[model samples]
Target chain A: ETEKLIREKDEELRRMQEMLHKIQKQMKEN
Target chain B: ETEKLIREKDEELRRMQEMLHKIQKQMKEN
Candidate 1:
């Protein structure tokens, strides 16, 4: 039961990280 | 073990939300 929830939040955080990375890419570009 | 890890991440996410909420509250407190 608890492990199932860990993956749920793991996926949630993983998705949020992509947005951060994309914003980072914009700043690093000329 | 995994539940402990989830709790740590949960705490981290909570702090970040507070940071954003502080900024929002500051700007819109009029």
Candidate 2:
């Protein structure tokens, strides 16, 4: 049960990080 | 209740956006 909760937060952070990556790509830079 | 949920998500997105802004500042292009 505890592990499931950890996984849930890990996924939430992962989801948030992806948006930063996506927007970064849109920026004009290396 | 539904409006509270929206506000919660808005804050979440606000957090994710701040990280992006921070990281974006690290990058130099101008």
Top TM-score prediction, candidate number: 1
Candidate 1 Cα errors over 4 Å, as ranges: A1-30
lDDT of 1 by residue, A1-30 (tens): 644555566666656656555655675593
Separately for all candidates shown, the number of backbone clashes (residues 3 or more apart, or on different chains) is 0, 0
C-alpha DockQ for predicted model 2: 0.05
Tell me the lDDT of model 1 at B3: 45
Superposed by TM-score, candidate 2 places the C-alpha of residue A14 at a distance from the truth, in angstroms, of 0.9
Candidate 2 CAPRI-style tier = incorrect
Q: Please state every model's RMSD to the true fold in angstroms.
A: 16.0, 14.1
Error of 1 at A9 (Å): 16
Worst lDDT 10-window in candidate 2 chain A: A21-30
lDDT minimum window of 10 residues, candidate 1 chain A: A1-10
Q: How close is candidate 1 to the true structure, as a TM-score?
A: 0.45
Off by over 4 Å in 2: B1-30
